[PDB]
Amino acid sequence: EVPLPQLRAYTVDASWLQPMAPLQIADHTWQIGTEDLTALLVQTPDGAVLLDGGMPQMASHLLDNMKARGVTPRDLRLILLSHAHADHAGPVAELKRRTGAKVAANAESAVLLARGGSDDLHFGDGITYPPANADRIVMDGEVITVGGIVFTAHFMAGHTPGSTAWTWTDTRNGKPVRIAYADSLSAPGYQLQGNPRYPHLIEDYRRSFATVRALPCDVLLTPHPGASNWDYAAGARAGAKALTCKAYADAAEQKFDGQLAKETAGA
Numbered sequence: 001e002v003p004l005p006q007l008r009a010y011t012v013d014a015s016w017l018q019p020m021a022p023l024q025i026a027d028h029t030w031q032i033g034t035e036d037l038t039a040l041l042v043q044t045p046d047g048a049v050l051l052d053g054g055m056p057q058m059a060s061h062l063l064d065n066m067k068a069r070g071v072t073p074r075d076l077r078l079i080l081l082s083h084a085h086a087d088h089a090g091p092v093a094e095l096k097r098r099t100g101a102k103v104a105a106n107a108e109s110a111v112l113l114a115r116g117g118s119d120d121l122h123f124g125d126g127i128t129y130p131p132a133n134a135d136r137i138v139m140d141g142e143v144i145t146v147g148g149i150v151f152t153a154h155f156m157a158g159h160t161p162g163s164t165a166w167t168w169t170d171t172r173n174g175k176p177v178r179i180a181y182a183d184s185l186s187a188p189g190y191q192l193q194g195n196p197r198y199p200h201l202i203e204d205y206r207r208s209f210a211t212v213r214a215l216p217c218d219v220l221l222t223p224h225p226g227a228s229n230w231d232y233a234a235g236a237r238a239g240a241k242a243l244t245c246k247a248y249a250d251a252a253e254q255k256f257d258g259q260l261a262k263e264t265a266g267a
């Protein structure tokens with residue numbers, strides 16, 4: 001008895017995933033996700049780029065916000081990812097089915113996306129989402145040019161093996177503005193030392209702290225806005241108190257060092 005779509009009961013907090021209207025970050029860069037999850041739209045004369053989508057259920061809201069910005073399903077050309085977890089790559093598969101968009105990702109993020117976040121290094125099969133295929137594989141430092149906007153990939157392995165920062169230069173009030181979309185640097189509940197699924201985890205995190213610190217970075221944004229002290233609901237004040245790349249990296253490294261001290265302490 002009971003149809004398959006009725007066998008599951010998902011936990012849902014009304015406060016999660018509050019929709020918002022497009023919030024302008026620079027002349028061609030908008031936040032079009034929710035108050036609590038970043039999804040960046042970059043509009044160019046040669047099509048639009050979307051960096052992350054948030055949770056699987058966010059597809060229709062993303063498309064509504066795209067329409068409001070004048071971006072039709074045919075105009076969405078490129079999807080880029082911070083890391084391929086359910087709360088950031090959730091709606092990618094559906095977006096691909098409903099638009100012209102294609103996915104560029106590094107090999108690690110591509111394999112994780114293609115298996116829908118299953119067999120996660122730390123969370124097993126508890127965070128699975130609709131799988132999607134990558135259309136282009138990128139290497140570290142590779143650049144993708146869309147309508148004269150140049151995006152560069154900076155690998156920062158740790159939170160996932162394929163964690164990536166993307167940097168591009170927009171304009172704001174005439175001047176160029178160097179935007180850095182830096183992935184998470186958290187290790188939440190992770191076994192850091194002697195982890196058989198990730199033997200060099202600590203060394204990778206250490207290098208990614210240094211990579212983030214050194215990013216070309218007039219404006220830092222992060223997949224979880226709280227992580228860089230953005231407040232997307234605050235309208236034109238949303239970025240007032242945003243961390244620098246240095247400070248974001250420094251805070252992450254201090255938390256990480258604290259977790260590692262706790263894991264390493266005797267019982």
Ligand SMILES: CC(C)c1ccc(Cc2sc(N)nc2C(=O)O)cc1
Binds near residue numbers: 087159185188223224
């Ligand atoms: C202190 C505990 C509650 C905690 C704080 C911060 C995180 C980080 C999280 S959560 C989530 N869904 N994603 C992330 C991420 O880094 O992408 C995870 C756990």
Ligand SMILES: [Zn+2]
Binds near residue numbers: 083085159184
């Ligand atoms: Zn994650």
Ligand SMILES: [Zn+2]
Binds near residue numbers: 085088184224
């Ligand atoms: Zn997350």
